[PDB]
């Protein structure tokens, strides 16, 4: 039952120590979370998709799936459905800003963004930058763009210096072929055949950096539960410094996240 990726990140040894993410407010900035799922405890939320007003309806599936990864990692964590994406899994950068902004306003400890776009935004930078300056651990998926020669394939927001950009590793520590590369790549987490919660009281495997991202937003919630006095700055440095070191930072970042080593 307990997803494999939970183990890979060394989540089980932190849990035993007694740290489960108790008192941590986690924003899932996505397509919403399905309210019908008996295995998903939503603490609240808000919608920013002009046509899809309920954060609690996921017409996509991605946000429900993401949400289940957060809560598998950090079971005692407080989950919030911040709906920024519609039915097709796309939203406007403004809609993403409005989501960040509610998370700042709502005194969110951890932001997950299992999304991005190819193109930069000064406004998208200002919103992430402010969440970071406010003391929020900002976590984002690195993108699914592979290798494009010498170029960074890292989407925005993960491309920003303020955000923790998360690539995907499989079960064997191998970088997923789809996994966006570059200097902006911070850490690897499980992103290949991830079993999580899906809409309509379902379970199922998804692959993507959006599956690696929640494992790191869940890891930040676990550190924050052991070290309530640690800043976002300390949470990030410990995560980047205590990794299972893989190859080249351009492909792997710092390596695989080790939550047990990171928690201190």
């Amino acid at each position: 039952s307990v997803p494999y990726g939970v183990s890979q990140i060394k989540a089980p040894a932190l849990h035993s120590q007694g740290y489960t993410g108790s008192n941590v407010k986690v924003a899932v900035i996505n397509s919403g979370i399905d309210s019908s799922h008996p295995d998903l405890n939503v603490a609240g939320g808000a919608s920013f998709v002009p046509s899809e007003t309920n954060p609690f309806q996921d017409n996509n599936s991605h946000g429900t799936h993401v949400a289940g990864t957060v809560l598998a990692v950090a079971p005692s964590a407080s989950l919030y459905a911040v709906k920024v994406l519609g039915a097709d899994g796309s939203g406007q950068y403004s809609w993403i800003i409005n989501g960040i902004e509610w998370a700042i306003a709502n005194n969110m400890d951890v932001i997950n963004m299992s999304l991005g776009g190819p193109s930069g935004s000064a406004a998208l930078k200002a919103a992430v930058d402010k969440a970071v300056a406010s003391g929020v651990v900002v976590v984002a998926a690195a993108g699914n763009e592979g290798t494009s020669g010498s170029s960074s394939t890292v989407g925005y927001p993960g491309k920003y210096p303020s955000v923790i950009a998360v690539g995907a590793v499989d079960s064997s520590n191998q970088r997923a072929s789809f996994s966006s590369v570059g200097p902006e790549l911070d850490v690897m987490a499980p992103g290949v055949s991830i079993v999580s919660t899906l809409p309509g009281n379902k379970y199922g495997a998804k692959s993507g950096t959006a599956m690696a991202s929640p494992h790191v937003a869940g890891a930040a919630a676990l550190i924050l539960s052991k070290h309530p006095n640690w800043t976002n700055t300390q949470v990030r440095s410990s995560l980047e410094n205590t990794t299972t070191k893989l190859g080249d930072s351009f492909y792997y970042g710092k390596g695989l996240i080790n939550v047990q080593a990171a928690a201190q």
Partner: protein, 71 residues
């Protein structure tokens, strides 16, 4: 095309939600969502409104409101 984010100057220029809104509508823009923390707003702008707004003393940036997807 039509969806843009207007970045404001504050001690170079603009402060109020009512000033922010007038700075847009003055150049034929249609203000969408005025940001709480970010000194910017989402706006509906034609090609004229983008070039007029790019030259306004109150404007820092005019950028397209890009599309993001779930990874």
């Amino acid at each position: 095309e039509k969806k843009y984010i207007v970045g404001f100057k504050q001690t170079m220029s603009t402060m109020s939600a009512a000033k922010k809104k007038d700075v847009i509508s003055e150049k034929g823009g249609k203000v969408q969502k005025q940001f709480k923390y970010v000194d910017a707003a989402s706006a509906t702008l034609n090609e004229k409104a983008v070039k007029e707004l790019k030259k306004d003393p109150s404007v820092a940036y005019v950028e397209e409101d890009h599309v993001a997807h779930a990874y």
